[PDB]
Paper text:
The viral nucleoprotein (NP), a key component of the replication machinery, packages the viral genome into protective ribonucleoprotein particles. Although TiLV-NP is considerably smaller than its influenza counterpart and unrelated in sequence, it maintains the same topology and domain organisation. This comprises a head and body domain between which is a positively charged groove, where single-stranded RNA binds. In addition, an oligomerisation loop inserts into a hydrophobic pocket in the neighbouring NP, the flexible hinges of which allow variable orientation of adjacent NPs.
The RNA-bound TiLV-NP structure has been determined as part of distinct pseudo-symmetrical oligomers, including two tetrameric forms with pseudo-C2 and pseudo-C4 symmetries. The pseudo-C2 tetramer adopts an elongated structure, measuring 116 Å in length, 99 Å in width, and 70 Å in height. Within the pseudo-C2 tetramer, two A-form RNA double-stranded helices are inserted at the interfaces between opposite pairs of NP, whose single-stranded 5′ and 3′ extensions each bind one of the four NPs. The pseudo-C2 tetramer exhibits mean interface area of 1294 Å2 between NPs within one dimer and 994 Å2 at the dimer interface, while the pseudo-C4 tetramer exhibits a more uniform interface of 1313 Å2 between NPs. The accommodation of an A-form double-stranded RNA helix at the pseudo-C2 NP interface, as well as the oligomerisation into circular pentamers and hexamers, is facilitated by the flexible hinges of TiLV-NP (residues 288–293, 308–319). Within each of the positively charged grooves of TiLV-NPi and TiLV-NPi + 1, 8 nucleotides of RNA are bound as in the pseudo-C5 oligomers, but with free 5′ and 3′ ends, respectively. These two strands then come together at the NP-NP interface to form an A-form RNA double-helix comprising at least 10 base-pairs with a total of around 37 nucleotides visible. Two such structures bind to the pseudo-C2 oligomer. However, since the 40-mer vRNA loop used in the reconstitutions corresponds to 20 nucleotides from the 3′ and 5′ ends of one genome segment, the two observed RNA structures could each correspond to a single vRNA loop with a promoter-like fold, i.e. with a distal duplex (with the loop density missing), and single stranded terminii splayed out to bind in the two neighbouring NPs. In the pseudo-C2 structure, the duplex A-form RNA that splays out into single-stranded 3′ and 5′ extensions that bind to adjacent NPs, could also mimic the polymerase proximal promoter duplex separating into incoming and outgoing template strands, each binding an NP at the start of the RNP superhelix.
Author numbering:
A (entry chain D): 34 to 309, 314 to 350
B (entry chain A): 34 to 310, 317 to 350
C (entry chain C): 35 to 312, 317 to 350
D (entry chain B): 34 to 349
Write the structure that this text describes.
Amino acid sequence: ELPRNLEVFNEACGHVFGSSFNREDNSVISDAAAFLFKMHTHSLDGQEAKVLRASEKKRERENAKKSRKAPEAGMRVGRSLILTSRWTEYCATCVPALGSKMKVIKASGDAAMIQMMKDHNSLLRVCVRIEVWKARYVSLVALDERIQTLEDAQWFPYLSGDSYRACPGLVGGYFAKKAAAGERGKNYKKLNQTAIIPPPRFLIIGHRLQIGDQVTLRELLASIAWGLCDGVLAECWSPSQGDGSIGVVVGLPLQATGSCFLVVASHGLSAIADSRGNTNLLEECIAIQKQDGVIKCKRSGKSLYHCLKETAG
Amino acid sequence: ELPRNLEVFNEACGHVFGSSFNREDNSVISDAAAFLFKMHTHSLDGQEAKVLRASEKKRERENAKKSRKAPEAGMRVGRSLILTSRWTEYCATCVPALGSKMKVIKASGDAAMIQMMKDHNSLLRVCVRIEVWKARYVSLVALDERIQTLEDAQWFPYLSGDSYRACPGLVGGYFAKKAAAGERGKNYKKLNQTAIIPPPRFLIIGHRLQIGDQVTLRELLASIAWGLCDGVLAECWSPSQGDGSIGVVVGLPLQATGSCFLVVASHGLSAIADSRINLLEECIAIQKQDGVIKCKRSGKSLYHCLKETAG
Amino acid sequence: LPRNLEVFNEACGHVFGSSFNREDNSVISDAAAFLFKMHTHSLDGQEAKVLRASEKKRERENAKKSRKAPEAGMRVGRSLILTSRWTEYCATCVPALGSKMKVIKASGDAAMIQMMKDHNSLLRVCVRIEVWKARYVSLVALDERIQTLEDAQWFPYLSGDSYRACPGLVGGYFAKKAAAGERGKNYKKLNQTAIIPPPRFLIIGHRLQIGDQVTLRELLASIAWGLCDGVLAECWSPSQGDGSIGVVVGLPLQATGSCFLVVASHGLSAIADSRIEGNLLEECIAIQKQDGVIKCKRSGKSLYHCLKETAG
Amino acid sequence: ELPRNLEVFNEACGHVFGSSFNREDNSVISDAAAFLFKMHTHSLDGQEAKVLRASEKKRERENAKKSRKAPEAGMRVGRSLILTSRWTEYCATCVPALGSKMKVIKASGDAAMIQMMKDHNSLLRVCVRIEVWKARYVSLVALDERIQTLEDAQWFPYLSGDSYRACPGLVGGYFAKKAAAGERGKNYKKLNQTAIIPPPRFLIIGHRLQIGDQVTLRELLASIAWGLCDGVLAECWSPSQGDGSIGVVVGLPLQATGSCFLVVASHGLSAIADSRIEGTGNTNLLEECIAIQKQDGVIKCKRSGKSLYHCLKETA
DNA sequence: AAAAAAAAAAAAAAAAAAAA
DNA sequence: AAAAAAAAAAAAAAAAAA
């Protein structure tokens, strides 16, 4: 009925949170996904330490983490999630042992082990996507102090190393900065900061975001952009005739590509980083694909977070 | 009627330095503050050894410090401070034992011990504020060699770990950099290199800095900024009749809003450094007796401005 | 004509019959590419590159070897048709896979040595033609590998054989590696903008010169590429009704270029350019004309964008 | 008679190059030092391969290196250096095995092994210094294409990873770039680009560069600066009364102390990486000074405003 | 505000520790 | 000048690699 990824995510969430997992709230799904991701990187207290090439301080931190008691059952997580007594069984069963690699499992040849590893990787990917989406949603109302210049804002979102490894094409941060600065291999992916990510309640059902869906302005905006993208993207929403909290998606932005403006030095010339302004820099236009067709909407010239705050005024 | 914070420091300084402690000389107050800070941090000779996890060299240094003869009455600390015979009693009775933690003091329930611990903590905060002000004052005429590039200049003042542990919001340095390069949370504080610190002679008596109070140019400049800040801040000081190295404050700069107005390039649009928006035309907001005014930046560091205007 | 061009002309004739037009850039480029593939044993039914090939590479080489070879009359490009003689040529002139000049020299066979030298010259000519075609293509559509000036510095990006044949002109990954290798007498500096006559001029030894009828795109490709400065367009003047034909009025200098930086040291201030001391869009290029060198102000836009705007 | 480092370098060069090692030429000493460095890093053909964490291409390259025959006795290196028949014995004896670490040897406790490891470390450092000096000397007459902007020139000289590991305080390149960009630990060292490196003929003798020494202009300049440094440094040379090709050193430049023209942002203002440049002035830039310590005393010499390489070319 | 908690008597170059 | 060597055929998601 559903692909492997969504099926495994639903199974894991149901097993670990029992009946307390709501399937129609973005925050609850996000909390469940974040908790599950924590459960799969060997980061929770009482899990195997990371000491392969750990510095003395890292050795101490990992030893302290290992010594500390693991989370107990019946524990409240997030706002409306309560662990079930059988979460330990799922953790012991479906969680690969620390250091597990696909090469070793394939050499062993165990079909069950291979399937469990595939499910683990798929759940990692789905939870990383949900966590990036929730990061976008948070940035729509609460600015991050770390981001202070376009040079820093270029690497948003800031996420842990395992998050970068799972989805290098979507997750930025320190690891993405190092990868971009270092040698670029065959597996290098450029940080597609504004990739489309369906909301949590759709990302676990497979219903791809599209026109006609009934969604809130904040959730749609965090899906298609983040806190510091231009406010013109707000045009992609239309309030409904009812309460107005949940509207309808009318159109989605289109990703422009190409058209480099560099001019390499030759015959005694000097390089030009950008050939280009004020009039076009301010107004500008963005291509929004609607049901009727593509429309060029002039950019509002302001941050999305500022636009949302002003509208809330 | 001074707050307990300043009362504790005044009493300690009196007990430790007799009449030699002048409450009107900034250098003397600073020397006494540093002395009290090193005493209450267990760094004076003959004090307990920091050998909880000391390395070989650090273990040897701590053992030598413990073995070394402790300071005696009549010792000269600075230029115009002399220890008294009561300093030994003050250290024995007021300084908490090495490694003492407020958890154990609260668990014991002794009200006197809790009061002593609170007094020690407040005294450390006061002495750290005074030390930060002294670092700002010194850097107005002689810059730290560790400051070579904007990255290094972003972390002034460079004070030891204990100082940062006392007032995280003011002291920069290696520990501030480490905290910056580590985890962040509610308990995390931001280094405010230009947070207003009243001068020592004004700090220990509770007098807040305000327009119209007699101060020196260096005093105000260190009390509102440091050596490498834009020279425009010098406008906050105006000499009196005949100057005489003493003037008056005419304003106090306002702080910058932390709101970020960036708009990152996306979907083909062009990135904007400031949605609201020349470099030498920027203005600072000064709160004067009348109201807020805008003063154009000078473009030169206070250190260089003082060097050039010295003669 | 020099043997370097004579070998290419003879091979092209023997392979393509009379269909090999010698006055069209596209036809010559297609023929050169086909000959380069033939002499690299990259065609169907040719040898297999299995010295150290990995499992998948080994399998693909085996499949290519087993795959049927091209037959006479095959249509290559748009206006080139193979001749039955080509096989014989491919049987004789093409060196066996893995043959090294050391073994040929040790053998002492004069015929084999001459064949190897002819093969090397043919490879050099084919690589030059491929570089010109790459510039021509880049003049309309840009490769995505070039996003920053650092990546643009190594254009064109060609295989290792291309760099080996003509290290002076070809760049790519192998040129990047050689830059980090070491410096010596054999070391040749990359010249991204060397004057290469169009294929219709190269195979006949028609060195580009002022007064030669050439298309604007032809001249731009032969003396520049897509991302160069648009001011180079000053070197071409149209004719009656243009009609994609004009004339060369001048050529840019060979563009040696020296670095005039002065890095800060011992407290002195860094200088980004020694000459400028005492404006970014005011820079000018030197063009040698029939009369003398002239300074032409830069346009500030890449040649690609200039051409795109001119088209529409 | 001489420190440990110079003694071990002389011993190694004498053992490896026999009597063909000319002790009074810069180029010959540089070639010998570079060859010793390559031998001691296990990069000569016929030495252990580096495969601990090697990528497939690196594995192939190292396997090819291992398979190839090692250099034979009498092979010509550089210009006037010929290997002796006993170089293989020295390479096998004095070169620590690939992956050798000082911790393992210290745990073993073998005095001979510890001494050999210390000698290898010292020779690595001396050869790195010689090769850095030679890179400078080459930059005085042959520009580098890699250096197109001040950002790139900030990392000169470029050298291999082991070269950076041996002498982080002088060697730049990719590895210094990575260290600076990444976390800065307790062992981090800034690139002292223009440190004073006595010529290789003195660097192997211990005669520190100082006033009164007879040296060429090119060698002295490469010792106290590199290709793109300011031209005023040429004032540190005084042509002799004879031919004038080879002169004497009068004074050495002093690493400036006091230039802190930064202006950090505060109260909404913006940082200034350098006051003079942002001042939009040229008068100061043409009237700078450099503090040359001479025999009589310190002197302030006005900067010539042109690259050292260009000044050398124009003089010739 | 309450809580929690490394050659300018004392800040470059070379050495022993650590390790394109 | 020589030697040494979703615009029949260019993003998103999956199985390979990590």
